[model samples]
Target chain A: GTKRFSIQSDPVEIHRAIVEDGVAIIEGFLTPEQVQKLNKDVDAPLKADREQFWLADFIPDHVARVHNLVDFSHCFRHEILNHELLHKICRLTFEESGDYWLGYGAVIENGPGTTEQKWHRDQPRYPLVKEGPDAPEGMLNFFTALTDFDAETGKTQYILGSNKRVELGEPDADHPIEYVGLKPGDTTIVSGKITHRGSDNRSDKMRRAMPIMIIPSILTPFDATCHLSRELVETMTPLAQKMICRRSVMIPAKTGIWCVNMREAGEQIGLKSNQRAKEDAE
Target chain B: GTKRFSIQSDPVEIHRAIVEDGVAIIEGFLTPEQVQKLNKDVDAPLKADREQFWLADFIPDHVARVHNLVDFSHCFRHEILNHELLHKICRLTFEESGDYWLGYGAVIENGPGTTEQKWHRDQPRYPLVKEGPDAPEGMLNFFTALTDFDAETGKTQYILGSNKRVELGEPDADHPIEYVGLKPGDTTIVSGKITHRGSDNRSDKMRRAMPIMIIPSILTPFDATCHLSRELVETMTPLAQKMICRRSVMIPAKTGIWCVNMREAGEQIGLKSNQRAKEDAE
Candidate 1:
């Protein structure tokens, strides 16, 4: 079944959906080994120095896979990939409210030298969604642990309900988090609504994990910023393989920081009437 | 010797005065902890839950001492007080090309909590001064640490060459560096030109730092956005105090992202002559 949202007709149902059911969880979504392999095969390999790796021309091979005007094969997965995604989530719940889109295939990867850092939460910053006249919606920071996360290997550690009180009512400016270490069988799921980070690696052997998030696309899409080679988008899903990505809802921003997604902003200046004027003006 | 700057004919001489002559430091510099204590004390009693700190009775007491706004008492010495002023330093350097005010008792606790966060800078974000046909000069950021910091204790981490690179280009909408930490009893000084943030207290104890900057209020003070509370002007040196705080130096923001600061916006349109007229008709 597709994940779709429906508004509640009853007031009591609405409260239950927003407050009581703050989050929902799905179990064993990805095997820990699979997660690690995904990171290794996708993220790390792409970022690995070509001269240092067996396939010195691997980067070019990956570049050939891209179809957009411009794109990089060796983009740092840990830095650029995750951050761009966090931006997407931010645009959705925090920025444009519901103005976002998802694009392209899962451009993620991993390497042998995985740094299993500290374990923490993602909820300390954004306690509430400053989007619309509704309750705050947290992000789903899900990690498909390719390996089982245990105390010894480094498992994803999480605290319940940390999303209740965010430091700035948004994500931490530093985005300091570590959600790594686990056995080869378990999966860890977190909400962008809660505080979380990864754990330090104590074991001698390396640990691996693959983290991918589902967020609105407007703020972040592979094709939007990166020039993807036509070949790459060819292999992506039908919807994601499109020629161009969607732009943010914040187009033609309103006066004085009012967000188009923040319904309140649209209502303040008689947006309905002004919307026509805006369309006509355009 | 005077701590403020003087416009001399020789560029080489001015550089020597700033770097070799030991000029940036000024006396009456308050310790970070001292500022924190005074700031916290005047704002409210510990755990004194007023609906809003800026609107509360203790607000005047608080802002009178604290330079930047925050419930000082509630914050640890290494908390919001020093951190925010650091933001001011970053803003001014880019906003005014590195000229800003470094004053004790940076105003905080404006009457109550939720006070409308103002958009004034140490000097104007856009300096009125011109140097022939060149873009105006920018400022740097540095603060005196009250307490010591180690990696475990969380010392200030300065982004090397952050300033030089900032002047070279514009703000990166995706990634912004904030909160560079440092050791106490020492100074972490970088170009007022760099974009940086003050490190937060992640250690067991607190961190404290105060700034001793060399500002450019002598030649010309900004007049466009001189909306600082009257008292802020009172504490300045006879010459320095008279200069108006440049409120307009802040980006005439049309959009407000929660974590996005005024300086980043200033980087967008700093001191550029605009053909657009003011919309005072409304």
Candidate 2:
């Protein structure tokens, strides 16, 4: 009977809603005032911490601790955590838990970043598994439309089913997507594994979303790990709790685990060759 | 006792083999002879069916079908499908019913007639809920390398973890990827919803792969509905069989179910700013 439901849900359903429907409305997830306040605060960090780059100056350590000072109900950090937690909930609901965690959380200020803040999937296998079908699934991705995303401004552009292909580029050389428009309170849940990127925010205001990875547990271990309260973990289904925080097998910047484990998945098992290489070599 | 034992799963080990170890292998799924046969057949259609294109009088339906008889053993197709299927299985395994289905099946032939394939997710909604995350998931794409697919021979190129983004294409221009190499029997599985594309077969010899959808049952109907048989269903997962032969949602000349469903999915769900003018409306 309910046309809308809370963001909390089974991972499978969340996966389908994003893959098939394209847009989902998370009920009472964030209020307008909260959204407005978070946007301003998210911008605050960039303004106050102006430097060569957020990473260079903000420092992963300082940025990681941003949540400690910002108000949870009105800060980008909380929204990012919440978005990732949604992914974690979905993963657990679907029995697709992994070495999950949120790695980097950031906002989009301008265009033509080393990475496009345009249309692209949140995840794609680095190198297709040479032997196994299990390359990093790019399982689930979450995005909150804190900015007024649209073609005129800096918004995300996505292609339907682009996630299913082997090629990664504009569908054609001549035509390319400009942006994806979304209103506040609108949520776009994507197959973390689809190809997508962000666009240049030509608009006067910064087009931003507190981007978070509800990644499979192995590849990520977000900053929220240290932030979650015991009550939060206790109330959460193991999967839900795992969504907010997780550990990585590769141990950050480590290389061999990808190749070693992927090869084992491919040869010992019967992974489709491309998949084995996707996760292992890439 | 060995980790290898756990890697040989029908659905694949996401947390253990794929996510945890970073890879896994599957063996003996194909024979040496099959591999060899595929190599010989690589992109044969472009030559054999050339008459059908430049000279319509030369090649016809029967001729193309004979040449196009599905090759399940091709590493590109099998691997891509299986890779995607793994993602679906991950979602399903964690869900209440554990179900999903195929949206479409496609192939990229490394010949003059075939346009190079772009790396992209098969679904339009991408990370966003096309339906609801809880609905049936889409196909699992497995890329099987029937021949020695490499950068020189039009190997499929992909950006690892590109799928984690919510959009498709629009990658960082500074870092364009042109090479994704694969050996015979090599396969890669990515989310049915990740970003990827087949690189141009630069090789003189045509490089090709038969890509199909190995989807869950709840989302699609079976192709075998007309001549349903128990043994056929038993041999292949009933859902898998259905996806192989499911009736395409599109009438013709166009591929993909989302072509039809995107509008409905967009509106019924109240997606913001439906700006792409309707092809029919004009």
Candidate 3:
């Protein structure tokens, strides 16, 4: 089983583990009061919109989700987006760019009989060109247990060091699957390129976890920028502003076929000879 | 053939025809200068990366597309998002709710030997309900010609009044399919519910057109909010800002099976006990 430490653990040790294994877990990352608040805040929505939650049609019908947690809870906005420890981990992981934003957050509840989720990367949309040490630090996915996680209650399964592998197949003796039994308030950090998924919940109790995806500033966010109303953004703290990408270069730039020869197009549109256009000419 | 008018024509007449036919064309909606600028801006990109254009297997190999026009050219931002005539038509058609946003934009170029596109409703993702006058204006698709259009060159095909009918098979006499031969600067507007597709190009020269989708603010936008940098957003004019949905509520507040009881969850989020939530509470 993989070792889990606390936020009080040495940062240097945690960084080393993350770089080596593609993941690390922090025990009791949130206070009991914070955990209680998150559970209470998301409970009502989970029960009310159970039908809509199955739109993706991946998990069991009993599974539900509460999306845009930052918009739904001040506690989440503070603890998930503005927390100091998470920020330090993000900076260390994406140290080359010194830029990252909250890509998305959702509180997932897997009730009894919920089956195993598909094994895939969090940022599956990104092309898997680089592997091992050359792999670009794209995005980081953090899972926080709102309820005790065990085999019966369902824990998240992962293939350690899979982010470095060029080819990914079913687990074998060389790369066996591993599951972490996270207690309430325990947080697990995994690189977005790591292959993982939610496990089956055979226990009588529902399994609840909140996951936030942190993306590099250069990447486009899965969550819409308009998730928070203009009025709400105005009221957010400077730290929250950065986390939500208010001032980041995370905007969706031209991609794929549309990105070709945009400089000539920009020039025709009166953006002629601008430094910005030249910098992004390619 | 469909009748074509100009913005200089009576709005009442245009409105009446649109309601009766579910589509209408406005000739010379853009000035010749505007059309030239758009054509010049998009042509280079279209020619440079023809290989990447066929992302989807459904569209023609001879056809190329430039998506996210706003990110590519400032002219598109003003003309597609802030054009006065387009906005007026959208407001008139989607009168039930005077709310709409620039959903998506693409400049389509049909080169010689391009085949007819597949026939389908633009809003096929939405559930089909409410026909005739009772149908809510779900989505509005606007097409502006950048080059001359005729039977030889490619034009857009539409099944008139199909928006009111439940069954959609193929084009016939009763529900006769019509094509509009638009000259440069001419524009066509249609309800997304109407079945349509691009016509085959038999001419030697390429035919180019730019289409903009106007959607109810409540609908999901095809263009991701991250399309523009925060710095660029701050510099845009007020009209362009609104057109790009800089101040709109474009977030996916509820997705999957989690739409249940959002009001109560919102209350827990510290939105302040107000009439807004009560009014929105289902």
Candidate 4:
């Protein structure tokens, strides 16, 4: 049997793999040149910064994290975040067909001599979301690699079909646990409920990965440490603007249909309320 | 043929009536005593006020109007606004199952001998939303009568099934138009795109009607003159709180799941960011 469950980047196929195995590795989600460009974009920012560490209980060794990668990576902000295929897959999982919101974007680099991370589900333990066949997934993550990942280096480890389990027990003989490493530019789509973690890096280099999360319209992001600047926001497409506007507190705008139909209709009927009696009002 | 569509208070039946006709008179939506109490609640508040008028082009005569009736009436806030049947019907029309928001709640009293209002869709025209058979109704209204309504007393009029017209032409013999009057406590649910308005009042008393609008989670309300006080908002149910929180800008809250899962998981991993390092934070 193949050690890895890799597939083409079609939305439905990847979505199917995630539902069945709690995660799916999409083959060559990015071009090697794109990955190189992404690294180059982040080079200046992370260059002077000291390597950060997670809780000793969580990572067991220090790893670096960069929040709001979309703020830096051109490929991420322009194409990868708004990738049509990813949006379709998210719609299938969340069932919010009208539109969605970006939860967060960040890079996590597991350094050499790191220990395996504590196995945990991305979703909250209190919600205890037991995602099974045909369940609407509440949240999803797109984990893309900017560097090569394999058993020798750090890679994500997921227990096959463990997403359907509410309270996980220690994995024994029957349950399949595998380290899902990928070539540079490949990606993994993981369900929030999947029992997963980053495997220890035995290699002498860093395990560079970037993950971005997508959420339904009903949710307000809790991980909003970085926001898109107004200049960058205006440069994005209208659909992207709708996704990022509310959470981007720096912008002095709220997300709503800016239809001036109300204003026009009011003027037509010669009806103006005290609400519109103010200056600089819409 | 019957001039009005009088339907039982079943969600599907009332929804069907609103679909078939531009408006539906839902039989006995409120009790006569409920109407009396509603009138009494507003009597003191509106008594000292002067009668207000719309533009001569809109109303053709002076009429008294009140915004945020939800801020005053007990029956409206406690029961009517949160009536479960209305939620089901609104879900059917808007197809937003998760939740919704209050567009606006207000009263309009066409004084005795006042002229008819211009025939217009409740929805704005530029979006040019033409709601037809089986089409999702974008916005909706629940117009409850605080007093008796009849041809002599000034009731609402409707160009039946005219909700589907984009650019409405003068109605000829083929299209049916009728004045829909209701007893105290009865209500009418009108489609936003319906071509309808208040008819002239021939009686000696004021023709008092209160219309409250409900929109899907997707849209923001245009008319928001009065807001629920903090004390009152606290008294409402969770669902009602969710509906009113956002546009009620006075309240310093945004609509979203208040799940602390992210915080807990972060702490378990000994992760604290600058975002949470401030005072008075959640």
Candidate 5:
């Protein structure tokens, strides 16, 4: 399908599909072993947090969620956060400079009898003056299957290229909507601008997937600075620091030694918007 | 001395000296075991590379430096970067918001006969319009002694309260400066705005210290992002992520999709500047 590419396929080709189609699936992005590790890491948490489902009123008892999976294990960070292809795609689709952060990280599960999620677009989390084919894509969402996902097992339903159209309030009978079929280690990248929904689980087995949202560094809905305690924010890699919106050089007279903005400071130091000023020359 | 504070002292009192005195020492910041572990972790790298001295022409033969020590071991991050008091001091001294990043981390050794380093301020890596007392403190530099430091050995020398005055061209006959005496576990926190230099090492024993600089997240001269590979960035804590300049929900228009400034998006959904909108109540 034009929607999918394998690890063995050329990355340039995949990039084209992501930009043109507003969605692309990567097959075998994770090895079987890596997928097993990710599954194991979330298993315990999912078992204990049973009531944490999406749309609690609908199938509240059956749906499960493990939020903030990024901090749970190194494996998740390695496979999900630091994936080279994902970084490249974010750079290509989000910004040429590739400046972004984890908008959210969670593992979602749908048990048997769970109903389909209502159709929705993810990015108007903020008011959009104009949102249509022309509106900027705010975030990129990637759904990685931890188990086999098919029409019967709560696969994600997406409107093909719906990202190009504004006002995707509800799909008409003629609209093109498709269910994804993904195996363990496969991932589908969807633009937040696209219209999509979680499908009902008609099968006996549970459907599990890890979904991650990559947002631009400048405009995060998440309280990037306060995601973790000061204690936990200290040892992360440079990229992780930016993801959490670490304080920067820009200081206002009234903030009382406050350091709230990241991009503001980068611009103050004359850092080029792209590549963080590779030469350090203003 | 006004330049030194003790571990037994209250952080607020110590913070006062850090602000008023421009530099303060914290004795016993690391345990003996911690010191040994840090020293050992970098031993192999130091020994394998003999050509690792600075300014080889003028006392370069006797100096040694191990840059980016934070990547060497978890112990360094825990004790140095993630230390409770250090983080607290960074927030108080730099910003009340406490959103700073590890600007630089390095281990230095001054062998016998190493001459004094030229006097300088750590900040203003870029040209500054107003320096000294009037300029806001942009960074915090900490020197943790890994071995006993005395005047005979290479100890850091600082001009007393130099941070408050502008135009410190060089130590005039009346300028007050003194060498710091530190035990293995002792550390001296100096404002990057202060004037200081590495002292001459006349003692027989090799003097070792780990010098780290905490810079405002906005402006760091160091390329903190590239210090670790993708493999390491993913595994770090939230704090470490901020130290390396990871990008966030901020994006650009040229990239296929664009995520704009943060608060603009936050307020769109009725999110207060601090907490995200509760229950998606716009």
Candidate 6:
């Protein structure tokens, strides 16, 4: 049978699917306007980058990854990074109802000449840390399709339940893989534990998408810093500012772990948000 | 001119010396009672650990490093990690008037027959990070003397003003190195940027000291976490609890950097401390 991930808008159901199948897709999470604006916003920089911006690991030149997306426009800082819907899912999946922020925000576009990324988890730091069958689902890979994601466009492929495998092992010749196809504005919420990769982009058009990691705030070991400058952060909403403007991952950040002093230090710098608001409220 | 670092008890003067020299010794910083207690506290563990627990880099077998000082007793949690004196020094050095933390709390003991360590900065992560002459002073290394530190005991040696050096080069034949001498109760507050290392122990006695890193709250990139367990953390003071209990480095803490969301997520887990106390108060 063909493998496909569940598409749902309900946070509870989305979290359930993630726990069960190690991955899920939030259907039509972003509006059409958002897709247009996002594409329009990144079009020039994407073209301007003569040399591939991100040449991490052994990925060939066909795949292009651009970071500091929020640095370009306020939309990333607002609609995407500060969205309540995704945050709700984070609160549910991580079993945390407090705050979660964008750990690493970037745009990954697979062009027609691209090759398949090997089966791997979304983990960045300490790649081999979570090899056990019971490894903690470290972070969520939110792949927001900026364009149509299908077989031709090189939708992400998953080795079903490989997240729990002791060793990822090698891929099967004819792999029993699941393809995550989506229209623009749809996001595939993936578990860091799951083994997956971007398929080859055979289509003539670019397979553009945003792979923003919704990291559980309490993660450590991989140091992170939001590249946005202070001048830009000052222009954002208190909540938006709060979402992207970090005091701690600025915990490898350089912020501390499990240490309550992280927030107090932020307040001293006057960047930490106010405590007067409700949990879900901005 | 002899480069013996200024020794003082005043916080303002200590900060001034640090700014001027990038190193200072808090003369008689630790009380004799604390010295005896701390030595007594770590004595057995120091002896029991026969295998030379830490065999990092190319350090010879004569040097021994012991971690989880807090795990051994409540004194580490109360006396050292939550000390007001060191915290004040941290506040002055990082220019932060609020919360700071025990980034890396460890003991470095040099037994007789040990060789000299290369002149180097105490930087751990991204070793080549602070090369620029004007690079920001990252973290502070607080060396608390557990034994008499002198030429005989292999006191820590420094290249004065090396904190501002672009390249360390090699040690001079008749090196103009300044040896930090201290009594059992003294602490040598050195800058992370300054180049220094433990000298060889030729006196047939052990040169033991605690090299606790007091990290600036705003510093980013080096991820950190307290090794204390939940059971041990629960027994700490609201202030001591706040000092080490992190929701955020808990921010690379697995805490966020500069982002306010780090603490909120901590509160959800119920490990975070309260906001009822005053600054510098428990």
Compare the candidates by DockQ and give the number of the best one.
3
Residue B209, candidate 1: alpha-carbon lDDT? 40
lDDT of 6 at A136: 49
DockQ of each: 0.02, 0.01, 0.04, 0.04, 0.02, 0.03
Docking band of candidate 4: incorrect
lDDT of 5 by residue, A1-282 (tens): 336788777777776786677788999987899889888998887887674311222335578876666555556644455677777777666543125677667787888888888878776432212245654456777778999998789778878767667666455564577788899989998776678888889999978888777765433333233334333444444445455444332211111111211123322233332223212345
Q: Give me candidate 6's TM-score against the actual structure.
A: 0.50
Segments in model 1 whose C-alpha atoms lie over 4 Å from true places? A1-25, A30-40, A43-96, A102-135, A167-187, A217-225, A241-282, B1-282
TM-score of chain B of 3: 0.80
Where is model 6 more than 4 Å wrong at Cα? A1-8, A50-59, A96-99, A125-131, A169-175, A220-227, A248-263, A272-282, B1-211, B214-282
Candidate 4 global lDDT: 0.58
Q: Per-residue alpha-carbon lDDT of model 3 for A103-175, expressed as tens digits?
A: 6677889899898888877653311112234565667778889999998898888887676675554677876
Better of 3 and 6 by lDDT: 3
Tens-digit lDDT string for candidate 6 (A39-123): 9888876665426311233346676655656666556866786677787777776543123556566677777888888777776
lDDT of 3 by residue, B1-282 (tens): 555788787777787777777788998888899888888888787886476621333346788777667766767765556677776777777656445677667788889999888887766331112233356676777888889989899778888768777655478787788887888988887776577888888999889888887776543345544335444555455556555555422222222111212222222223221122221247
- For every candidate, give the share of true A-B contacts it also has: 0.00, 0.00, 0.05, 0.01, 0.01, 0.00
Question: What value does the lDDT take at residue B38 in candidate 3?
Answer: 87
How would you encode candidate 4's per-residue C-alpha lDDT over B129-200 as one tens digit per residue?
224443456678888888888878886777765766665534657557777768887888888767777787
Task: Score residue A130 of candidate 5 by CA lDDT.
Answer: 27
Q: What's the CA error at residue A271 for candidate 6, in Å? A: 3.4
Better of 3 and 4 by DockQ: 3
> On residues A119-229, what C-alpha lDDT tens digit does candidate 4 reach at each position?
887753211122433445656887888888887887677777677776554565755777776888787887776788788888998788877677554433434321233
List runs of model 3 lying over 4 Å from the truth.
A1-33, A36-282, B51-58, B127-133, B249-282
**Taking candidate 2, what TM-score does its chain B reach relative to the real chain B?**
0.52
Which portions of model 5 show Cα errors greater than 4 Å? A1-282, B51-59, B96-98, B128-130, B169-174, B221-223, B227-231, B246-282
